[PDB]
Amino acid sequence: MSRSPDAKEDPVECPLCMEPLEIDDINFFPCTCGYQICRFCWHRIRTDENGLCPACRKPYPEDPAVYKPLSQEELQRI
Ligand SMILES: [Zn+2]
Ligand SMILES: [Zn+2]
């Protein structure tokens, strides 16, 4: 009953377990490559797993193991 070509919108669905993504869960991905999961999917990857990305193979952005920028590369030491 409208003149617009798009008068509706669907919610996102966790493509890992299949569930209703909450509002703050929409952009809740453990990785910035898009591979997004819900809370029941991330509560297991960052727990009994290496908190890594099963889609691009990367450490979730949030200090997963230790994180290292570029400390001593040759270890000068004394
Ligand atoms: Zn899920
Ligand atoms: Zn990723």
From Swiss-Prot:
Known outcome of mutating residue 16 to A/E: Abolishes interaction with E2 ubiquitin ligases
Zinc finger (RING-type): 14-57
Subcellular location field: Cytoplasm; Nucleus
Modified residues (Phosphoserine): 71
Annotated phenotype, changing residue 49 to A: Strongly reduces interaction with E2 ubiquitin ligases
Post-translational modification: Autoubiquitinated.
Extent of the signal sequence: none
Function description: Has E3 ubiquitin ligase activity, promoting ubiquitination and degradation of target proteins. Involved in activation of the JAK/STAT pathway. Catalyzes ubiquitination of methylated RBM15. Plays a role in quality control of translation of mitochondrial outer membrane-localized mRNA. As part of the PINK1-regulated signaling, upon mitochondria damage, ubiquitinates ABCE1 and thereby recruits autophagy receptors to the mitochondrial outer membrane to initiate mitophagy.
Self-association and partners: Interacts with CNOT1 via its C-terminus but does not stably associate with the CCR4-NOT complex. Interacts (via RING domain) with UBE2D2. Interacts with ABCE1, PINK1 and PELO.
Name of this protein: CCR4-NOT transcription complex subunit 4
Source lineage: Eukaryota, Metazoa, Chordata, Craniata, Vertebrata
Part of the intact protein present: 1 to 78 of 575
